[PDB]
Amino acid sequence: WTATSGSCKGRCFELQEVGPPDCRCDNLCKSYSSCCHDFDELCLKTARGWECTKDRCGEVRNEENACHCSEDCLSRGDCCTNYQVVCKGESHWVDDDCEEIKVPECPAGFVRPPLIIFSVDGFRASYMKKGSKVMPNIEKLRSCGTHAPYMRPVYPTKTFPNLYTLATGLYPESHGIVGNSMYDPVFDASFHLRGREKFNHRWWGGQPLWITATKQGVRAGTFFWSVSIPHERRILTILQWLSLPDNERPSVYAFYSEQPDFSGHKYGPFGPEMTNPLREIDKTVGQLMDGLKQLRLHRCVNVIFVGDHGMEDVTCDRTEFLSNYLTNVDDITLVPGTLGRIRAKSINNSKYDPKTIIAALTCKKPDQHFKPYMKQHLPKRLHYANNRRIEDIHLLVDRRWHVARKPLDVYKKCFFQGDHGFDNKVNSMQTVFVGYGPTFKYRTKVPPFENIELYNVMCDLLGLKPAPNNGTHGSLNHLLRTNTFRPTMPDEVSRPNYPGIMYLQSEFDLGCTCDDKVENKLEELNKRLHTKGSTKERHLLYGRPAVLYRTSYDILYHTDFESGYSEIFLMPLWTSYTISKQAEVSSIPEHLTNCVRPDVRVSPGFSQNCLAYKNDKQMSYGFLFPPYLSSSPEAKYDAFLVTNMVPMYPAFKRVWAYFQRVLVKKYASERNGVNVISGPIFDYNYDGLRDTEDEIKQYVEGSSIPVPTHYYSIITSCLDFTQPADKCDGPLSVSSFILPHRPDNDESCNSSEDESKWVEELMKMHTARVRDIEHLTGLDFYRKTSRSYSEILTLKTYLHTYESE
Ligand SMILES: *[C@@H]1O[C@H](CO)[C@@H](O[C@@H]2O[C@H](CO)[C@@H](O[C@@H]3O[C@H](CO[C@H]4O[C@H](CO)[C@@H](O)[C@H](O[C@H]5O[C@H](CO)[C@@H](O)[C@H](O)[C@@H]5O[C@H]5O[C@H](CO)[C@@H](O)[C@H](O)[C@@H]5O)[C@@H]4O)[C@@H](O)[C@H](O[C@H]4O[C@H](CO)[C@@H](O)[C@H](O)[C@@H]4O[C@H]4O[C@H](CO)[C@@H](O)[C@H](O)[C@@H]4O)[C@@H]3O)[C@H](O)[C@H]2NC(C)=O)[C@H](O)[C@H]1NC(C)=O
Ligand SMILES: Cc1cc(OCc2ccccn2)c(C(C)(C)C)cc1Cl
Ligand SMILES: [Ca+2]
Ligand SMILES: [Ca+2]
Ligand SMILES: [Cl-]
Ligand code: NA
Numbered sequence: 001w002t003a004t005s006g007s008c009k010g011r012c013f014e015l016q017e018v019g020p021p022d023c024r025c026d027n028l029c030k031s032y033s034s035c036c037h038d039f040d041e042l043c044l045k046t047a048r049g050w051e052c053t054k055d056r057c058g059e060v061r062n063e064e065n066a067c068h069c070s071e072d073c074l075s076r077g078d079c080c081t082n083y084q085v086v087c088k089g090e091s092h093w094v095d096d097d098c099e100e101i102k103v104p105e106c107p108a109g110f111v112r113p114p115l116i117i118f119s120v121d122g123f124r125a126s127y128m129k130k131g132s133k134v135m136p137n138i139e140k141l142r143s144c145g146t147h148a149p150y151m152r153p154v155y156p157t158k159t160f161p162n163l164y165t166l167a168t169g170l171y172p173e174s175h176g177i178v179g180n181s182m183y184d185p186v187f188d189a190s191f192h193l194r195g196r197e198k199f200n201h202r203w204w205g206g207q208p209l210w211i212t213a214t215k216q217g218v219r220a221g222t223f224f225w226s227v228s229i230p231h232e233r234r235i236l237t238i239l240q241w242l243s244l245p246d247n248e249r250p251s252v253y254a255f256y257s258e259q260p261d262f263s264g265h266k267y268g269p270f271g272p273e274m275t276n277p278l279r280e281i282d283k284t285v286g287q288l289m290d291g292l293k294q295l296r297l298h299r300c301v302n303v304i305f306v307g308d309h310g311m312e313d314v315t316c317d318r319t320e321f322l323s324n325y326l327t328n329v330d331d332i333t334l335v336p337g338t339l340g341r342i343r344a345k346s347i348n349n350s351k352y353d354p355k356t357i358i359a360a361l362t363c364k365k366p367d368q369h370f371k372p373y374m375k376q377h378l379p380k381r382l383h384y385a386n387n388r389r390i391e392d393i394h395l396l397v398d399r400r401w402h403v404a405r406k407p408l409d410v411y412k413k414c415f416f417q418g419d420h421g422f423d424n425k426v427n428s429m430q431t432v433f434v435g436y437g438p439t440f441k442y443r444t445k446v447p448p449f450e451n452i453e454l455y456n457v458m459c460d461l462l463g464l465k466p467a468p469n470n471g472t473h474g475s476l477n478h479l480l481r482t483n484t485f486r487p488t489m490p491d492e493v494s495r496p497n498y499p500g501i502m503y504l505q506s507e508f509d510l511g512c513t514c515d516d517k518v519e520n521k522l523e524e525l526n527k528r529l530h531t532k533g534s535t536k537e538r539h540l541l542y543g544r545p546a547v548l549y550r551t552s553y554d555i556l557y558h559t560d561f562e563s564g565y566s567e568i569f570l571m572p573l574w575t576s577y578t579i580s581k582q583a584e585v586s587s588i589p590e591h592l593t594n595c596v597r598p599d600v601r602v603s604p605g606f607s608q609n610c611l612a613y614k615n616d617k618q619m620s621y622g623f624l625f626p627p628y629l630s631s632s633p634e635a636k637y638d639a640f641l642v643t644n645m646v647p648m649y650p651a652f653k654r655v656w657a658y659f660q661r662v663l664v665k666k667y668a669s670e671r672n673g674v675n676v677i678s679g680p681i682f683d684y685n686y687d688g689l690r691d692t693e694d695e696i697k698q699y700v701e702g703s704s705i706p707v708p709t710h711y712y713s714i715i716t717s718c719l720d721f722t723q724p725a726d727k728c729d730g731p732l733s734v735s736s737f738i739l740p741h742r743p744d745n746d747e748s749c750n751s752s753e754d755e756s757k758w759v760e761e762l763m764k765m766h767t768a769r770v771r772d773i774e775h776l777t778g779l780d781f782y783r784k785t786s787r788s789y790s791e792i793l794t795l796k797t798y799l800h801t802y803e804s805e
């Protein structure tokens with residue numbers, strides 16, 4: 001119950017929400033059916049529309065009008081936004097030359113430049129170039145301010161997941177808004193776009209910007225705008241708030257537009273009907289900027305023009321139906337559309353089986369336009385698993401496609417021509433970023449970055465300390481003229497041991513054999529030096545990685561590679577090696593096929609053993625430093641040390657072997673040398689974070705050798721490829737991956753074919769940021785370079801996407 005017969009007199013768009021059943025006058029009241037009786041009359045005035053005209057200039061104040069043209073309007077803070085232009089011979093903001101804003105130019109009483117977030121729904125990244133002729137206000141912001149060619153949304157590329165990620169700096173798995181539709185088994189409650197449950201606070205995790213601001217003494221405008229409040233009224237409300245007294249005035253504001261998304265769904269992303277919504281958004285920006293200029297805030301406010309996701313062409317006829325794959329379709333619930341999430345219709349049905357559902361959905365038709373996954377097998381870059389609201393079974397749907405349960409779902413609901421929600425690497429899902437103001441740089445283009453980073457920056461813009469989040473604070477310092485955050489490198493927690501020769505061959509009973517007892521004072525001094533780290537400057541180019549947790553490990557040097565060997569996990573945490581453009585690929589000689597050699601620097605008790613692999617009929621082994629890339633027949637023996645061995649399923653070895661034999665050399669050729677760091681990852685609870693030893697669910701049979709869930713590689717070279725990787729004087733270039741360590745290649749539908757037809761495609765799918773690997777390993781890379789730390793932070797957040805331009 002709301003006693004809706006109090007009054008909004010003097011209270012229109014109050015910043016604090018009053019306790020029901022007192023009636024409300026805030027921008028959320030419409031949504032709760034709780035506004036006072038007179039809300040429309042007082043708060044949603046429309047009389048005479050939104051613009052001053054020649055005849056209204058210096059009129060007599062009529063408090064019924066939507067906005068005012070009377071002489072007193074400036075100090076009342078409620079002029080139409082074009083008041084000065086029509087009535088005082090001023091120019092529109094867009095017609096003014098842009099001039100560098102070197103310092104904030106703010107009215108007295110402003111403690112800090114306000115931040116206005118101008119968010120646009122469905123604003124695909126290529127609209128900036130393609131709609132440029134019809135968006136002059138946006139184009140001035142873009143060319144005069146700081147902009148990226150595009151900004152990567154999070155997965156799924158839907159509205160609430162992305163807007164709440166902008167507000168929190170968190171992945172959807174962590175903030176809890178994991179889709180536009182959801183069931184939470186702990187609450188036993190559902191979340192839907194339509195309706196009221198979505199307003200319950202238990203859905204919304206983390207700490208959004210407006211709470212961060214409030215807790216820290218910075219006042220915030222409201223971020224949610226009820227759909228029936230027109231855009232002109234949202235702008236005028238922001239401008240009115242900006243005229244509040246210093247103690248009452250918020251420092252952060254948000255505008256939101258439903259367009260161009262609303263139209264994009266109906267007409268497709270480039271439908272001829274799309275020009276008009278883009279014009280109208282631009283006019284709204286015009287209104288805000290003219291409004292700010294009138295208030296003398298146009299060189300004071302920092303403005304962020306940001307989208308939540310793009311929009312792709314999608315029609316009813318490009319729909320895959322689960323009824324064409326499954327016989328048991330009625331025993332499942334599907335969250336449908338541009339992604340699929342499957343669960344059992346009833347938890348009383350113990351006959352339901354996820355294994356048989358996956359297999360029935362796997363590679364069944366030649367052009368199948370979705371791929372099933374257990375959530376933990378999704379590309380790690382999606383960060384889409386560690387939440388109970390995310391179903392165990394997931395369908396990644398091809399761009400341009402939908403998945404539905406039965407055909408009747410689609411024609412008893414062609415309506416739409418656009419949709420979004422796909423993999424966040426997809427070009428059509430990329431959205432926009434522009435920052436304009438005293439705190440942003442002038443006429444500066446920055447590289448594409450992910451929207452998870454913006455929360456930190458908006459905190460910097462407001463002098464707030466960000467709550468813990470998934471951004472890498474400092475990675476966006478190059479966007480900013482001032483207020484940069486000066487991060488320090490994390491301290492190393494465990495220092496390595498540097499073992500020398502401490503064990504005789506006969507102390508090892510590992511069941512390993514090697515054909516290696518084949519016999520110089522020149523090359524004996526030489527080999528000792530390699531074992532002491534003589535070539536380390538060649539293979540370890542950026543310093544050794546720091547281990548940021550408590551553990552026991554050894555550094556091991558070799559002619560061709562260096563490793564950090566964990567005495568706890570019995571394998572390297574990392575292995576580093578550099579392959580020059582000129583390097584040669586050789587094969588594993590016949591006499592060395594099954595060779596594994598004890599490492600006399602490392603105790604038998606801290607070593608793997610060959611017998612375990614023999615006994616484990618499912619599990620084989622591979623090497624981190626590939627024997628194929630050995631520098632000489634004698635150095636090749638190093639690659640067969642038991643300390644370079646890792647557990648690998650035979651199916652995975654097909655992947656790994658092609659990577660090491662073919663692709664490393666290809667990249668070295670193309671990139672002019674590469675430095676490679678490879679290692680295991682253990683993430684059995686799929687939280688994106690390094691497992692402790694007591695979290696490991698699988699071991700090589702009858703041993704304490706833990707089985708990785710993934711293998712990573714970080715591949716670094718000179719950004720200026722005219723310099724070799726090992727002699728690079730400037731910025732670096734990186735690509736990385738996190739490959740799932742799986743006992744089958746069911747993920748790759750063409751896997752019966754030659755590795756050259758499928759392997760590289762799989763690696764691309766599992767592309768990753770160095771930062772993702774850091775989370776998963778507790779290592780910190782690039783500790784010793786000649787580059788600035790903020791620059792290295794940007795490099796560690798880089799994702800190589802393998803999309804075209
Ligand atoms: C992206 O950035 C985020 C933010 O930094 C990273 O997430 C953090 O990760 C931390 C480590 O996993 C985690 O710390 C834990 O917090 C527990 C307290 O949690 C509450 O308080 C915080 C702070 O206000 C709050 O944010 C949490 O909110 C979660 O839960 C509510 C409702 O459940 C949701 O509304 C909300 O969306 C959020 O959900 C997300 O997080 C939880 C996990 O916390 C997931 O389950 C969800 O799926 C979802 O993703 C909480 O309300 C604290 O209790 C933990 O401490 C245990 O573990 C330590 C290990 O040191 C142990 O020593 C302690 O004793 C304790 O163990 C006991 O509990 C165990 C588990 O029940 C039990 O097995 C033991 O035997 C013990 O009894 C822990 O410290 C932190 O909560 C989140 N923060 C957020 C916002 O998610 C994230 O990792 C980053 N991602 C990547 C890839 O880097
Ligand atoms: C800029 C912005 C706006 C916004 O909400 C705007 C909105 C969306 C849908 C319907 C009505 N209003 C939000 C949420 C989290 C959704 C409150 C976050 C941000 Cl960062
Ligand atoms: Ca949206
Ligand atoms: Ca983990
Ligand atoms: Cl969804
Ligand atoms: Na085996």
Ligand code: NA
Nearest residue numbers: 745746748751
């Ligand atoms: Na296959």
Ligand SMILES: [Zn+2]
Nearest residue numbers: 122261265420
């Ligand atoms: Zn949409």
